Amino acid sequence: GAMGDILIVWAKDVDEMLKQVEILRRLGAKQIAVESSDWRILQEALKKGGDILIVNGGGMTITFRGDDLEALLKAAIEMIKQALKFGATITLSLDGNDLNINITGVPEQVRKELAKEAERLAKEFGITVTRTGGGDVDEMLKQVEILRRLGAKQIAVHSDDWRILQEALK
Amino acid sequence: GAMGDILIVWAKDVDEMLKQVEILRRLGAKQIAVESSDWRILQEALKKGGDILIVNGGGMTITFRGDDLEALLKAAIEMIKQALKFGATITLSLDGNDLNINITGVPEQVRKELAKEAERLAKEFGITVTRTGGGDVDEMLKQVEILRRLGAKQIAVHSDDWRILQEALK
Ligand code: NA
Ligand code: NA
Ligand code: NI
Ligand code: NI
Structure with missing residues (x-):
């Protein structure tokens, strides 16, 4: 729409997330990105029809x-x-x-x-x-692969988080 | 890559933004989303080759x-x-x-x-x-259109910001 293409929802609870996604849809939101440290909340966001996820790898x-x-x-x-x-x-x-x-x-x-x-x-x-969150980099790599298998199209990472993880992977 | 598809950079200064984007590229980052309240910083992010922008409309x-x-x-x-x-x-x-x-x-x-x-x-x-930031909703609608004319492919908005702006537009 005129205001943007993607709405970012910070999901701290699976039920509040589903309630927020539904309120935004009824307001006419087309694409919703969900951010969470909780892998189950991100899996629930995919199941509900979302495909842009914001992950917290090292934080x-x-x-x-x-x-x-x-x-x-x-x-x-x-x-x-x-x-x-x-x-x-x-x-x-x-x-x-x-x-x-x-x-x-x-x-x-x-x-x-x-x-x-x-x-x-x-x-x-x-x-x-x-x-x-705060799991090892290996458990994050695993959970990200699981989101991709469950149909995540775009996975976003905060640049500071990503730099910490690359320094850790080195 | 294995960690994700998009890195999110919060840009508070145009020179720090360009320095951060360059460091991430040298680390092999392919897609970088830039977030800022400063419309000139988002315009500079497009000029530098970025096309995903995170705007602050009402905040x-x-x-x-x-x-x-x-x-x-x-x-x-x-x-x-x-x-x-x-x-x-x-x-x-x-x-x-x-x-x-x-x-x-x-x-x-x-x-x-x-x-x-x-x-x-x-x-x-x-x-x-x-x-x-904190400009009227009309100035935001104008600045978003300017980013799209300058070649922004995806514009993202925080869901709480977007709900405040829709309540204001009503
Ligand atoms: Na204390
Ligand atoms: Na005081
Ligand atoms: Ni975030
Ligand atoms: Ni933000």
């Missing part, structure tokens, strides 16, 4: 959950200051009682440190945390 | 600049807490002495409030700030 999504938003924000603020100082690109959103943090562009050693800090910050502020 | 990029990183972070933290509470999706990175904040998925009235708060926070912490 991860940290999701803080709790009823006190100011406590989610205190945990997230610490993750942001540390991730930025290490040279990460970070994406944040609020989703019900969840604060989602997509982190790309840091090496595996730094990713492991950030994942540990996420567990500690969750304890400090009395909230829960889940990590999605 | 904006806030860039804090200063030598004290802890002062950039204090300003950015306030922008993050407010933007998230209003339901924005936010992307952050450090670029030399700059902290870049991409904000999408808030209506024009909230965008104006965030832009003002950015000016105030910059004064409070003794740093500078520049805003890119």
Whole structure:
């Protein structure tokens, strides 16, 4: 349409993803790209008729959950200051009682440190945390091949994530 | 390649963009998508041989600049807490002495409030700030048409940005 050709949906939950894709279709969206650290969410996006997927190879999504938003924000603020100082690109959103943090562009050693800090910050502020992605480069190569076999036409990667993975593959 | 078909570059500066595209090409990248709030950076990406562009229609990029990183972070933290509470999706990175904040998925009235708060926070912490994007929907429709005339094959929009613009166009 006049506004563009492709809509990018960041999918943090399989049901919210399907709900978002349906709302955009009813608004007349023709092509929808789905981004997720969760391989099952990307597989569900293909099954629903999508074929452009945005993968997170070497990074991860940290999701803080709790009823006190100011406590989610205190945990997230610490993750942001540390991730930025290490040279990460970070994406944040609020989703019900969840604060989602997509982190790309840091090496595996730094990713492991950030994942540990996420567990500690969750304890400090009395909230829960889940990590999605951050698998080895070999498991990513496997999951990407599976998406292609399931009918993915275009797979996109953030350039910082891709450079970390090439440095790791070398 | 085995890792994907498209690399996404977030371009906050025209020279860094051209430097990043060249580094990725030398690493053997075939297709590079460029994302920017700056229409001139997207025009430069087309001229350099790219044809997939990611536009920011109704949102904006806030860039804090200063030598004290802890002062950039204090300003950015306030922008993050407010933007998230209003339901924005936010992307952050450090670029030399700059902290870049991409904000999408808030209506024009909230965008104006965030832009003002950015000016105030910059004064409070003794740093500078520049805003890119947040133009009316009509100026976006014009700039998108200009990218298509300059040879853009695929234009992508964040789904939250696109929904704000459709609600505004209604
Ligand atoms: Na702390
Ligand atoms: Na303040
Ligand atoms: Ni992304
Ligand atoms: Ni983006």
